[PDB]
């Protein structure tokens, strides 16, 4: 089959996972895509994409980064 | 160790020389107590290593990542 670009892994996302129940974040290096940030999650392990406009991943990643 | 038994900050050590080309992505832990948050999957052998987080390419990669 044919395919135009790299699949984005992420094509749908969760708006409402809270800082506290994540164990990491991925940064996926799909830069074409307009979701590129999936949670793992602290009380099933399980992996969901998310939004990437929560104000709380901005100081998450802000705290990672200025160290 | 199994991550029940460890205290240790999971990354003793990190690498100033890895190309953003190469990274398939970037884990950022929830790891507050610790110097080193961002690990590299690594495209070419798959190895995660973590990354010094002054490595000039993260900054931009991040900021790319969440202005959409
Ligand atoms: O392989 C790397 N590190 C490592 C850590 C423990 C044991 C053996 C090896 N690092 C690595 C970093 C960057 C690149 C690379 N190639 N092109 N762009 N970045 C390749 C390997």
């Given at each position: 089959?044919?395919?135009?670009?790299?699949?984005?892994?992420?094509?749908?996302?969760?708006?409402?996972?809270?800082?506290?129940?994540?164990?990491?974040?991925?940064?996926?290096?799909?830069?074409?895509?307009?979701?590129?940030?999936?949670?793992?999650?602290?009380?099933?392990?399980?992996?969901?994409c998310?939004?990437?406009?929560?104000?709380?991943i901005?100081?998450?990643?802000?705290?990672?980064?200025?160290?």
């Amino acid at each position: 089959p044919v395919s135009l670009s790299y699949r984005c892994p992420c094509r749908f996302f969760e708006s409402h996972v809270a800082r506290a129940n994540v164990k990491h974040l991925k940064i996926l290096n799909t830069p074409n895509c307009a979701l590129q940030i999936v949670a793992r999650l602290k009380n099933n392990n399980r992996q969901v994409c998310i939004d990437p406009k929560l104000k709380w991943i901005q100081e998450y990643l802000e705290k990672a980064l200025n160290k």
